[PDB]
Amino acid sequence: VKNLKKYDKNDPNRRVLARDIEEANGGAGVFNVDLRKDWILENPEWKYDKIPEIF
Amino acid sequence: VMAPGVEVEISKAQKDELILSGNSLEAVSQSAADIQQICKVRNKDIRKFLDGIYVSEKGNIV
Amino acid sequence: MRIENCFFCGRPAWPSKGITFMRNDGKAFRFCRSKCHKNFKMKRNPRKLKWTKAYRKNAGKEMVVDSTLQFAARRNVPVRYNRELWQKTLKAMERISEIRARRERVFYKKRMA
Amino acid sequence: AKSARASRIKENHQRFKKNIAGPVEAARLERLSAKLMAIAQASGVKSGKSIGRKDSSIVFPM
Amino acid sequence: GSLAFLPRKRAARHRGRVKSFPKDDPKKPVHLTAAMGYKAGMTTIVRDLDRPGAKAHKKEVVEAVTIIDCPPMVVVGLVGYIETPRGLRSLTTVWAEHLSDEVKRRFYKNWYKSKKKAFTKYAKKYAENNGASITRELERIKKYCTVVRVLAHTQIRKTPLKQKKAHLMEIQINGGSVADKVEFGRSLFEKPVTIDTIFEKDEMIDVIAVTKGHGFVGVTARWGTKQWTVARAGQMGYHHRTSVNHKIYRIGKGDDEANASTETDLTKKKITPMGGFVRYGEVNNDYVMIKGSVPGVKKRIMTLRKSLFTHTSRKALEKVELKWIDTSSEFGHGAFQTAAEKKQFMGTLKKDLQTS
Amino acid sequence: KRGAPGGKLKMTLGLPVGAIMNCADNSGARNLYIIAVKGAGARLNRLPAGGVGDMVMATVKKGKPELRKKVHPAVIVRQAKPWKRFDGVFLYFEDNAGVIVNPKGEMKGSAITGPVGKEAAELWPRIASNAGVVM
Amino acid sequence: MAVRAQFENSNEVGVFATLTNSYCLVALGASENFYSVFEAELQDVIPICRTTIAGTRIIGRLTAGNRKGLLVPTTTTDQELQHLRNSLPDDIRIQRIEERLSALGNVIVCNDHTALIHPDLERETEEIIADVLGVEVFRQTIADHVLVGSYMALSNQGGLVHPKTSIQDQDELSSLLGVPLVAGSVNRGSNVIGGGMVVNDWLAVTGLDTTAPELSVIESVFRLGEGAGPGAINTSMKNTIVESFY
RNA sequence: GUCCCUACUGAUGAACUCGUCGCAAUGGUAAUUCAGCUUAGUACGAGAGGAACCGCUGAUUCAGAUAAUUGGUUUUUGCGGUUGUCCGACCGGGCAGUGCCGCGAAGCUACCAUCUGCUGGAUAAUGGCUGAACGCCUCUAAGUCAGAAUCCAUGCCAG
Numbered sequence A: 001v002k003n004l005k006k007y008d009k010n011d012p013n014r015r016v017l018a019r020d021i022e023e024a025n026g027g028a029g030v031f032n033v034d035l036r037k038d039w040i041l042e043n044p045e046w047k048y049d050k051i052p053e054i055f
Numbered sequence B: 001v002m003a004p005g006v007e008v009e010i011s012k013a014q015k016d017e018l019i020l021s022g023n024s025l026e027a028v029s030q031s032a033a034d035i036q037q038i039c040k041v042r043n044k045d046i047r048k049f050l051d052g053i054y055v056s057e058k059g060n061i062v
Numbered sequence C: 001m002r003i004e005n006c007f008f009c010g011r012p013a014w015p016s017k018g019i020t021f022m023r024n025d026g027k028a029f030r031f032c033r034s035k036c037h038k039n040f041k042m043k044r045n046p047r048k049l050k051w052t053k054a055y056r057k058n059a060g061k062e063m064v065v066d067s068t069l070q071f072a073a074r075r076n077v078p079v080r081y082n083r084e085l086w087q088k089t090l091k092a093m094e095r096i097s098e099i100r101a102r103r104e105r106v107f108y109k110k111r112m113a
Numbered sequence D: 001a002k003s004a005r006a007s008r009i010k011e012n013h014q015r016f017k018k019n020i021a022g023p024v025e026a027a028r029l030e031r032l033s034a035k036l037m038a039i040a041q042a043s044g045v046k047s048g049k050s051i052g053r054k055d056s057s058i059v060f061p062m
Numbered sequence E: 001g002s003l004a005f006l007p008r009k010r011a012a013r014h015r016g017r018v019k020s021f022p023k024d025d026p027k028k029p030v031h032l033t034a035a036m037g038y039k040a041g042m043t044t045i046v047r048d049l050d051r052p053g054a055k056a057h058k059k060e061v062v063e064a065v066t067i068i069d070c071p072p073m074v075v076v077g078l079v080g081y082i083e084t085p086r087g088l089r090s091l092t093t094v095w096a097e098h099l100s101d102e103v104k105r106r107f108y109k110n111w112y113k114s115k116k117k118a119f120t121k122y123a124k125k126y127a128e129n130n131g132a133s134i135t136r137e138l139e140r141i142k143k144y145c146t147v148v149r150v151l152a153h154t155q156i157r158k159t160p161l162k163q164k165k166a167h168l169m170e171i172q173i174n175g176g177s178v179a180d181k182v183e184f185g186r187s188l189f190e191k192p193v194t195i196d197t198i199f200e201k202d203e204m205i206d207v208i209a210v211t212k213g214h215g216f217v218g219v220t221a222r223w224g225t226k227q228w229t230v231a232r233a234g235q236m237g238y239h240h241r242t243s244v245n246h247k248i249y250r251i252g253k254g255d256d257e258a259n260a261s262t263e264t265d266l267t268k269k270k271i272t273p274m275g276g277f278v279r280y281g282e283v284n285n286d287y288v289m290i291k292g293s294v295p296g297v298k299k300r301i302m303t304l305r306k307s308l309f310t311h312t313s314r315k316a317l318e319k320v321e322l323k324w325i326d327t328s329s330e331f332g333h334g335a336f337q338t339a340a341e342k343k344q345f346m347g348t349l350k351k352d353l354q355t356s
Numbered sequence F: 001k002r003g004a005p006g007g008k009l010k011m012t013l014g015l016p017v018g019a020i021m022n023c024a025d026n027s028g029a030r031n032l033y034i035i036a037v038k039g040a041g042a043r044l045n046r047l048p049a050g051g052v053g054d055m056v057m058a059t060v061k062k063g064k065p066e067l068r069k070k071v072h073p074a075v076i077v078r079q080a081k082p083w084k085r086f087d088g089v090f091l092y093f094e095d096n097a098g099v100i101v102n103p104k105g106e107m108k109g110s111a112i113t114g115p116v117g118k119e120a121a122e123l124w125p126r127i128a129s130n131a132g133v134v135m
Numbered sequence G: 001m002a003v004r005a006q007f008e009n010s011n012e013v014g015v016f017a018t019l020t021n022s023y024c025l026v027a028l029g030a031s032e033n034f035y036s037v038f039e040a041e042l043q044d045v046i047p048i049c050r051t052t053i054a055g056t057r058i059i060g061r062l063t064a065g066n067r068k069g070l071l072v073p074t075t076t077t078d079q080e081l082q083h084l085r086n087s088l089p090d091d092i093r094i095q096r097i098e099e100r101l102s103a104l105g106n107v108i109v110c111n112d113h114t115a116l117i118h119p120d121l122e123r124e125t126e127e128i129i130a131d132v133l134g135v136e137v138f139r140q141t142i143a144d145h146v147l148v149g150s151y152m153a154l155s156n157q158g159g160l161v162h163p164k165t166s167i168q169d170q171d172e173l174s175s176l177l178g179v180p181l182v183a184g185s186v187n188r189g190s191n192v193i194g195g196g197m198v199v200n201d202w203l204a205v206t207g208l209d210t211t212a213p214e215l216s217v218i219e220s221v222f223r224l225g226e227g228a229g230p231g232a233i234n235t236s237m238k239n240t241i242v243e244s245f246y
Numbered sequence H: 001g002u003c004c005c006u007a008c009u010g011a012u013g014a015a016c017u018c019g020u021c022g023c024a025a026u027g028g029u030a031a032u033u034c035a036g037c038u039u040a041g042u043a044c045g046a047g048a049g050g051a052a053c054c055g056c057u058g059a060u061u062c063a064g065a066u067a068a069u070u071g072g073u074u075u076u077u078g079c080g081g082u083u084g085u086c087c088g089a090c091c092g093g094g095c096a097g098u099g100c101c102g103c104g105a106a107g108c109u110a111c112c113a114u115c116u117g118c119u120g121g122a123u124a125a126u127g128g129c130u131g132a133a134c135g136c137c138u139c140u141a142a143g144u145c146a147g148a149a150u151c152c153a154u155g156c157c158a159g
């Protein structure tokens, strides 16, 4: 936190930010969020896998 | 969409200005009118909101 | 998703099937059929009605002490996703199901001895 | 509320048709027609090349 | 009621007709417009919804879906129409050779006592060097027609129905020159065409059917009350309807043996409910699984056709991730997906000991 | 601003106009008498009705005399008539119950006795904050 | 630092957010404005999880936890639980509790050393909280309001309490906790502090209707921003508080 | 203190050999309002306050269907309990115009349940382009551009 840089909307090389990501990839009612993008598993390829629920 | 035979350019002589030239005066003028009509304010104040595309000069290329 | 169990009779309660009763004390009452709901509303004892798992367990019509039933229970502590873990779990579920079938066959044989 | 037959609503529908559904349905049709093609390819008078005659009224009988 | 569904009359035909195919342009690839199927029933599912902007976004929702038994249809003909100042006119039709007994039953009304003599001379026209005349008919279609349709019939003897008479209809070919469409149909002669070949998953379609009859019913139910504008008593039900925008959620292959299995439910089970569809039976063929309610009773003939207009909604551009399909009994309050699950839940029984 | 909630999905309405319900907060009111609902569409001979999460107008039939003085707005919290939630779950409560709220959506009381409807908690943040059991 | 934000158009950020010293939970809905302000304030220092519990957006009033653990009601589904587990590092322990008062964010306030609970919680829930959160659990009613999670917000630097709390009770709570406490309001006169504000040791998010005097009180008591200091309220800002909230 | 013809609404139908697949003259014609999200605490504003176009998601009414689920309905007189009387008693049953009660499939229903409701052209008020009448000027006289939930049609029902 003390090693961070304060966010400002005018700096050229600012942080990307999810607002900018959704504005680039559609809008507020069109962007589809990937809920598994931040999944921290053991093997990174196990993301986007259909976990069985009923057998 | 301009009529066939009318060329429109962003000319670098003055700022925020657009040149619309051609051979058919009717087509040129109608294209200018179409742009001016497409950019018109609604439900605002005419005396306070003063933005749009307007015909500034009329004449000949040569 | 999840497979629920009927509060009254214990049959598998699948999505859409049944009515859920929310009592004012804060506990939820999930039923699998209108039969179960109406029995609960007329306040009969599932421990007395003979077509219920409560009655059958009370009267010892089913096996209740076995590792094949200790292996499955509700989990309140999540485990991090692991493909080997889920696949091996599925195979273990198959093994457990057939072992349970054989044990229940033996139990009902012993009851009908 | 804008009517379902409003001109602005029709124009918005036209844009949506032309910029999303167009490409999506084009790809879908390409795949489907590929499958159709897979299943499908799974003297003039005396030969039929010259299309001749097989075997109330508009005019008054004379 | 609505003055748009009047003269409130019984449907003139049981099959139900398309009445409009989507407009055709040569730039698209060659394809067929419509298909046929038989209503088997309807069931319950759970879909992981991805509707950005909805409160059920990234949530599981329970939906009702209608199941249509769709055995592959057989192409047996090709019809060519011309444009005239009075409309479209069927210039000529050329059939296939070796027609089936079911389509010949369609042609006949008392099939049992009849000498089954339909299209025999036409087959002789193929075989006895009148193929010149047949090619002449094909070339007439090539050089004079503007729209081409293909004659196709269903397979009752695969559908679990007491009926034996099939159903013919013309499916319009779109996307190409008339020559390309003629070659396509001629090559499609004597070949089965599948529903996964005509449609596919995620696609909204239009369903043409005859909604169920209820006989002479008064105004209270006929219109919904407390000159043609005044509510009158008469026939209510058995009405031709074209219902639009129904999402195709799944196409099951019939021979898959795991039609009802999803990537979430690892149960090797098929679409047919435990005990069979009530009043219908089992679905052993290709089946179409579509959202919502659809006109028609069980085992009724149904027409499935492509949308007339390119879609304007995000519900038509969405993927459908299925979680599970209900296979419990429709004959009562069923709670078991499979007989194996029922046996495992209830244990072994007295008749089990007596038989074993 | 009319107290019509936004984004609410369809549910079966269980409390019509002229309906007596319990009061779930410690505001001192015991029962409420729904006389009007917000967002209703006037069609001939139909009595308007409201479901869990709808704002209504009610007169306190019994309770605190300060509250038995004016027509108060109220968000209805519990519904005895069964309704379906989009997860396919049909459910109902033991009684019909609501809480006194201002037109902005803020409660006069400080606590809610009994459980709260999930739709009401989602629709009104203050009820979600003053609720103890949410199902 | 103290920032003002709105979830969708609502000033109650505590209903839709849960901020701790090792993770942040954000309600999922429509746009990414709320997640984005939280991310711009926490640029990947700690994970942020877009989560739903029981198909609701009230995750802030439904979940309680600190940097050592997270507790969710029994109504939480296995999918949501697994989402939380995959999103959060293994150094945080997540559990579902079978409490009748399923409004966990309303019945529990917890800093990283102590927790204060609704007096009618079950004993088993008490040991579960004391074990998972790793805190000393005390039962108390704040300003005679039995929902501590709704009527008080706590951090390891301080704690802001219902505006109508007695001085004796405030002193007793301060002694029992170990941090400074101040009686203040959020969102221009709102008493629901927990529902209108989320705070950790270095970040607070309030509603957009939070006035300047009360935002300065928040920054001061929670030591957010330069010097801060709970004492400055009693020295530098008295005139402001007396003139504004007379 | 004076059951008939016809209109309308549906249903059959002779002759054109029976049948299958079609076309479409003409007639009918359908959707409606609100809200929420983003735009945006933005434009605008001293302050207090505070929009809109595109894009997205729901709800009211209306219309047409449908029954997976969930209620209701029971002559399934299907099963069980129970009152009075009777068949000598048990068992098994009759009678009480369906004795009474509980559950109850199937069918039927229900904005008490669920699904679906679609696009081109030409216009009015009006705003324009070129340009006479009238050596200025002028949207009009010749010519022409846009534009309303309007008009005519497609989609839809009948044939």
Ligand SMILES: [Zn+2]
Pocket (backbone or CB within 6 Å): C006, C007, C008, C009, C010, C011, C031, C032, C033, C036
């Ligand atoms: Zn049950």
